[PDB]
Design an enzyme around this catalytic site. Sequence first.
Site, PDB file in Angstrom:
ATOM      1  N   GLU A  22      31.748  43.303  45.801  1.00  0.00           N
ATOM      2  CA  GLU A  22      31.726  41.835  45.926  1.00  0.00           C
ATOM      3  C   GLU A  22      30.480  41.379  46.681  1.00  0.00           C
ATOM      4  OE1 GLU A  22      33.399  39.626  44.515  1.00  0.00           O
ATOM      5  OE2 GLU A  22      35.152  40.644  43.717  1.00  0.00           O
TER       6      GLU A  22
ATOM      7  N   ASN B 296      29.640  29.375  41.801  1.00  0.00           N
ATOM      8  CA  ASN B 296      30.254  29.560  40.489  1.00  0.00           C
ATOM      9  C   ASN B 296      29.960  28.362  39.608  1.00  0.00           C
ATOM     10  OD1 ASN B 296      32.793  30.751  42.613  1.00  0.00           O
ATOM     11  ND2 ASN B 296      31.627  32.017  41.220  1.00  0.00           N
TER      12      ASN B 296
ATOM     13  N   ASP C   1      32.028  26.447  38.079  1.00  0.00           N
ATOM     14  CA  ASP C   1      32.930  25.332  38.320  1.00  0.00           C
ATOM     15  C   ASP C   1      32.523  24.514  39.544  1.00  0.00           C
ATOM     16  OD1 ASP C   1      33.842  26.960  40.410  1.00  0.00           O
ATOM     17  OD2 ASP C   1      35.896  27.025  39.732  1.00  0.00           O
TER      18      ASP C   1
ATOM     19  N   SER D  35      32.533  25.775  42.667  1.00  0.00           N
ATOM     20  CA  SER D  35      33.083  26.423  43.825  1.00  0.00           C
ATOM     21  C   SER D  35      32.031  27.443  44.291  1.00  0.00           C
ATOM     22  CB  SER D  35      34.432  27.030  43.514  1.00  0.00           C
ATOM     23  OG  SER D  35      34.261  28.058  42.562  1.00  0.00           O
TER      24      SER D  35
ATOM     25  N   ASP E 207      31.814  31.361  46.437  1.00  0.00           N
ATOM     26  CA  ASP E 207      32.464  32.513  47.052  1.00  0.00           C
ATOM     27  C   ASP E 207      31.719  32.925  48.323  1.00  0.00           C
ATOM     28  OD1 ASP E 207      34.085  32.636  44.761  1.00  0.00           O
ATOM     29  OD2 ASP E 207      32.865  34.005  43.844  1.00  0.00           O
TER      30      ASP E 207
ATOM     31  N   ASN F   9      36.979  32.380  47.500  1.00  0.00           N
ATOM     32  CA  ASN F   9      36.550  31.226  46.734  1.00  0.00           C
ATOM     33  C   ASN F   9      37.009  29.914  47.366  1.00  0.00           C
ATOM     34  OD1 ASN F   9      37.290  29.245  44.197  1.00  0.00           O
ATOM     35  ND2 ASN F   9      35.412  30.447  43.959  1.00  0.00           N
TER      36      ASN F   9
END
Length: 129
Positions: free
Chosen positions: A35, A46, A48, A50, A52, A59
């Site tokens: 990750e 991301n 959308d 959002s 992380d 998220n």
Amino acid sequence: KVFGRCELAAAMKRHGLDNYRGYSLGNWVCAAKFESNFNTQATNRNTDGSTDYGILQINSRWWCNDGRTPGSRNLCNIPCSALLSSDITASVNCAKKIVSDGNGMNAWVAWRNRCKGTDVQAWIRGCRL
Ligand code: NA
């Protein structure tokens, strides 16, 4: 902070992740490696809108508040910036909530695609734990 593999394994163990909801420590270390490459400061945006955050790429749509993800829940009740600390407590505490949520570690795409079903014990081999 960029953790070493064993150093993070020991930190995660101390914060109660070893066998948390049935997931052996190597799972958690594997997920962190893919990750974030063990960097607490990792961020990724991301499609959308959002983002992380942190070692386990938590998220902002569901789990933390970063002030720029409309309609997001903040189920861990924490600013997303708390997840970037050299102290992994907040990340760990939030990860426990996530893994408890019904899909286990499949919540982490890198875990599902790079760790799941592999010999994850390898990630803690050699460590003093
Ligand atoms: Na949010």
